[PDB]
Amino acid sequence: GSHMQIRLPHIICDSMILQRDVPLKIWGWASPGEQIVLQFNGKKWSTKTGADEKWLINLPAMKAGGPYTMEFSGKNKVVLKDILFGDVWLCTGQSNMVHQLKVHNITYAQDIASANYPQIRQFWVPTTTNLKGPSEDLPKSSWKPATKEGINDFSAVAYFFARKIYQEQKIPIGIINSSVGGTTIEAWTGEDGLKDLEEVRKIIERNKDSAAVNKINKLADASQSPPATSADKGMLEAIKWFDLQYQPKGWRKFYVPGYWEDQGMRDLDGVVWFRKEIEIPAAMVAVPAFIQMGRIVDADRFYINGTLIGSTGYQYPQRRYTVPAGILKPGKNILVIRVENSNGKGGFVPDKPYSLQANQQSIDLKGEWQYKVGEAYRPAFRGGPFRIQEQAQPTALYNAMIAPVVQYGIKGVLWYQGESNVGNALTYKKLLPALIQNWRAQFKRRDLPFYYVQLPNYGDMRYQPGESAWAMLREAALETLKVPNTGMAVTIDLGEWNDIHPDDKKDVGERLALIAKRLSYGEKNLVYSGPIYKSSTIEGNKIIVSFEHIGSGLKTRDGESLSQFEIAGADKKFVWAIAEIKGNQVIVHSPQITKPMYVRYAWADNPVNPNLYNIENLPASPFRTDR
Amino acid sequence: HMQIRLPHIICDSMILQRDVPLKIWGWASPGEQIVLQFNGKKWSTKTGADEKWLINLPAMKAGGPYTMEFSGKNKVVLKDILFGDVWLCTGQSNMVHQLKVHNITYAQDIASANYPQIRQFWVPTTTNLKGPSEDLPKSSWKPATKEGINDFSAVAYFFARKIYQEQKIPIGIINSSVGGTTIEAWTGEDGLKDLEEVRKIIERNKDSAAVNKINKLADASQATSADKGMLEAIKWFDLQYQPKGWRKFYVPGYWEDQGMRDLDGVVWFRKEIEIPAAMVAVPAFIQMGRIVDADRFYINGTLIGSTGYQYPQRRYTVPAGILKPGKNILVIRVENSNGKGGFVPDKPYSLQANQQSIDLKGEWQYKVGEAYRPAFRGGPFRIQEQAQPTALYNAMIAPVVQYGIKGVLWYQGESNVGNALTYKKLLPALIQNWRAQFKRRDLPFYYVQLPNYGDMRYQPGESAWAMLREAALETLKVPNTGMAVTIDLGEWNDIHPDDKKDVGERLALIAKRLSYGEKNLVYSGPIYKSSTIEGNKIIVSFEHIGSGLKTRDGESLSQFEIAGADKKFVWAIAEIKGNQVIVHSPQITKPMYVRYAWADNPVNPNLYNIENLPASPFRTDR
Ligand SMILES: [Mg+2]
Ligand SMILES: [Mg+2]
């Protein structure tokens, strides 16, 4: 890593949006003693590279605007063009901030097609880890605009946030998108924020020891069983089951949607094939076709008339296959789906779209299919030992994808994470404030705005009160409002029972934009939160609940009675309660609870009808009054 | 008794057993002389002080009709009496199942049935905890013609029709069967005396005070409906109801699998469908599969059908005038008290009218009417007489021990999978008990090995159903018995499979060989005899190979497993070599045990003989 000439950090490149209204640092590397001259804003700026091969130029604050160029000269020449000054938002978290407009392009087709915001730009950070400590540079990437060429790669949440802020504030908006699916808050926290967790602390130190890491990976590889040979009859028989000439023998009836565990196939992991013959009118031939096959657990190959038209390797993507003209023929067509399933309930997720579309016509793909098992996997032990997976390691993502930008000026942080911490949801009460204060320390921005997303509803619904790990995670977010300069978007009405990646990203980004408009952009009278539990008092057989953020008043979303309220006495055995808005408060009681002491609202993974709002249509946070 | 009284089985249209000395018995006042006029001759006996009389008649050849005129203080005349073969057809619900509940598959058999000399005497469900009853409940002998065919047990009818077509004598069916019942309830006291825990129950149940003390304990020691769909001012089937708060559901399926966790209670389902004019002003037929547990089905606010429990197939006939042109509203209220509520998959869901059909699978809307709170389900409960040892034997078998019969058909066991190991002893004990009580130590007893049922598995495993089938297989040691294999006739999703015809006709093969002397008839599929170990092979020998072993589908032999000493079975290669199957697995270098079709529902049990009868499942480990 000897620098022989000027090198700029990857974030300092063409089209960047730099932070307006703050002293700016322009830093980089070069050969020792190399004389750097920067031509910028009608002036020349000079510095000498140190013996550490690093250089730094300090520039005075700039107001929003542009475009500018910068010309750097030393032993080489570097020219940067199309530089703007505006507000740079660091947008971070796991897969629901990762999720890009291109995978929500049915619902947001019109937003994608009309996006013409050349001064909203995203710098997307590839997934990167460093077990040794903070990295000095992000991976190579580019600043891409919210226009035709780059809109599809924007984080959907970040785009709808940025679009709302831009329309009202009218300054360039930069998005540093640093997000990785399936990751924990510990992986995103710098070492100093985790030092009080003794077991995590020891892992951090072990991971800096290459010998120790290599030992664990060796014992993982040594014990790693060899690759398994496929026993798939559908591929290994003389005629493959997608071959147009195959004659089904031994196939049974199946119904889409559904899981095969629920259709007569017990404890089965492996490969199951599905076959359906459908009649296609001539009007859907010789044109492109579009297949929506819901969501499949775990992986599928989809063949039409023997031709592979689509594949998805894992359970999370929605199946959306574009079929070229000429595959479908008039009359009888053979659809064959090979479903591979390595763990849990394989099959076709219900409450999802299953259809084939062409020429503004649609054919239903739900209903009767035929199935035959191609392979059943024999059970085996699967608990380890495992190699050290870097993105699961504490600090590893912070080090490589956050630490390199600490010198880059930023306006604030948007954070949407927690799905991967529901197993230590109680601990998250400490983990979230620790991350906030860690990033503030490392950025040297003790005032840095940090706005986060409370987890949405997800999972099976229940019709009796019960305990909930998701609810505990939502409480950790609620209680973190004690940290100065924070805000929380409630999303309990935006999720889906059957998907951890819900489609409605627009309302997430726009609810975060309300927080920013009030707290970062000084819109002092803007209602930016739904009702937030403040306090409660017991009066006889009733509990009276007071709230902050009532806007112009409390209401129910549907005009029906308040739902999802519970009440309990000293024994904490909760029952569904009667709840009624009176003035600015909610009165809770149950004829079954004589001496009530505690109230819960929307305390579940997926409350059926959380209908407490303010008149400004923002949902109340779930809460409990017991501790 | 001050007037002559005949047992309920001795009545008009009765089929009496041919070719045996016959007993005709009854009651009258003490000392009353009873005179029977029959077959051109008079018979006389005197009623004893115990109010009972008996007349012994000589054997009769098959035929009829005859009359019997009894004269005591009053006269009784019976007419339309036939002599033929009387089969006592017994067991639980798959013997109960009547042609009327299989009238889609057997519509034409029902329509064309014209056998006035095949007659069924159906016994209503009855129990007696005190001991053997002396009379059956009132019933009648009904013929297999249009007026009585629908009430025939389907298994018994298909047996009787096959026997009649070849043997050409009147066939009587004494149908004594009760759903959900155990073999112990069907066994007389003497057959259970060696099961000490059962014996103690038999004696307790004879003590009416002791039973009442338990029942009155239950009447003290053991919830209000909150169904919004019935209790809101506008009920959810009212045509004017406006759905608010309804969500999407997909039929077939269980709600546990569509987002409603741990939910017992009442869930309502709503679908609006477009009806073409050709389907209006004519009768309509709704098949709504099978529903767990109970349902009420409304169309345009009018209740068109209901079923109170999970077992019946839903088949509702809707009169002309309910359906209208255009938009029609279907509303189903489903109640579920235990287990997974909803709509059973792999069932028909459709509306038919005027040769057209509309799919009822697909997207419905749902809303929960009520969710039952958890509560203790263990009672205590009153003593249920149908569940008590001897209680069904006492009231539905014991009263006919003096009636001449040809043989017994038995189809039971589903309710004994919980003590399947004990069934190895219970089945021979019932056979020997009935033989003793009927004073027929040679009585033919032909039974049904349980069919396949339940979820399929793709790895070897244990199975209580398989143990129940082994009990049947091993009971073939008892003389004058025979077993029908049904491992290919059941259904994965129903304990009441539709194919009753093959059950009855496989039993008829057993009777034709063993009761009607058809010497060279192949009447059984291959039956495991023995096996030997030769290196890494186990060679299995079979009886009843007919004209040879084969596979049903022409593919490799399926469902064979092999294990070594540790009894860890793996799927094995199996090949037919004569009257033998050579079993081996490359993984098992020291094999000791073989299993075939050892599962609740073997995927492809394909070992047959050339005459198309299935081999019995078996294991060689014990
Ligand atoms: Mg599976
Ligand atoms: Mg249930």
Numbering used by the authors:
A (entry chain A): 20 to 646
B (entry chain B): 22 to 243, 247 to 646
Could you give the paper's own sentences about this structure?
We determined the full-length structures of two members (Fl8CE20_II and PpCE20_II) from the carbohydrate esterase family 20 (CE20) by X-ray crystallography that feature an ancillary domain, inserted into the catalytic SGNH-hydrolase domain. Detailed structural analysis identifies a so far undescribed catalytic triad architecture which lacks the typical aspartate for polarization of the histidine but instead reveals a precisely coordinated water molecule mediating contact between the His and Asp. This coordinated water in the Ser-His-(H2O-Asp/Asn) motif, as further confirmed by mutational studies and by determination of kinetic constants, is crucial for catalytic activity. We therefore term this active site architecture a water-mediated catalytic triad.
